[PDB]
């Protein structure tokens, strides 16, 4: 996260770290959506242009974390993966369309003050909240700058950007399964997700029921926090039918 701040304790209790077993290192962010299911970006697991193809046994999920590097004894919980499900129409060839994956845990994780699931949006909440200018929040342990790394989880609030501005910021073909967020050059304030924040949640707090909803997944961006560029996020509601289908069939 570039130009963010340290998270408060328990501020993002659905935040998950995807951790490589060997060598031991941060792979990506992710989010807890139930006691057994974790949501992330497909490109965290499968990206052939960079020879990335992780299987279940390569990774661990670490939940309840605040410190990036410490083993947070008596606070974090570490889970093994039973199975990975990548969207069947994930477009890694072109533009990362449908950049979404689910991971089923081997065993249910116990909820605590530091571990708690985020809500997935319904159509109405998505319609109400996914509007240009409305702000969401992104969290992660990724790079502090485009080209170092944070001691603890970082957070930044960013406004959703109008689709034509998103499109005009890039040569990539944008789809309805993506949205973008960030400040414009004229707006002064800045901030963005970065490498390592991939897969983490873009959340919004509903003013109707005071619950946090995951509207996006950190997906891609041209550099980090560049003027005139924006961060792109997987549109969670647009892919919710797939999410439900996987959970219904395999849960």
């Amino acid at each position: 996260i570039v130009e963010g701040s340290d998270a408060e304790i328990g501020m993002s209790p659905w935040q998950v770290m995807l951790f490589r077993k060997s060598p031991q290192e941060l792979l990506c962010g992710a989010s807890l959506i139930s006691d057994r299911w974790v949501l992330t970006a497909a490109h965290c697991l499968l990206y052939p242009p960079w020879d990335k193809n992780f299987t279940e046994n390569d990774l661990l999920v670490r939940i309840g974390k605040h410190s990036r590097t410490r083993y947070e004894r008596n606070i974090e919980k570490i889970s093994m993966l039973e199975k990975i499900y990548i969207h069947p129409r994930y477009n890694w060839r072109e533009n990362l369309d449908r950049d979404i994956a689910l991971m089923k845990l081997k065993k249910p994780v116990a909820f605590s003050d530091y571990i708690h699931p985020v809500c997935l949006p319904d159509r109405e909440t998505a319609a109400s909240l996914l509007q240009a200018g409305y702000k969401g929040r992104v969290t992660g342990w990724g790079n502090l700058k485009e080209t170092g790394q944070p001691s603890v989880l970082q957070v930044v609030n960013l406004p959703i950007v109008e689709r034509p501005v998103c499109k005009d910021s890039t040569r990539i073909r944008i789809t309805d399964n993506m949205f973008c967020a960030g400040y414009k050059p004229d707006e002064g304030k800045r901030g963005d997700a970065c490498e390592g924040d991939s897969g983490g949640p873009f959340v919004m707090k509903s003013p109707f029921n005071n619950r946090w909803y995951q509207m996006g997944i950190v997906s891609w961006g041209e550099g980090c926090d560049r003027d005139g560029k924006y961060g792109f996020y997987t549109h969670v509601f647009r892919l919710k039918k797939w999410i439900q289908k996987v959970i219904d069939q395999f849960g």
């Binding site: 997935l120 707090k205 619950r211």
Partner: peptide, 28 residues
Amino acid sequence: EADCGLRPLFEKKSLEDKTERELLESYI
């Protein structure tokens, strides 16, 4: 979950975090 999206250290105890108001203020 029925209790999804309500944080034990915040919503569940009616405490606000330091910047959530920034979000609310944008929901015009």
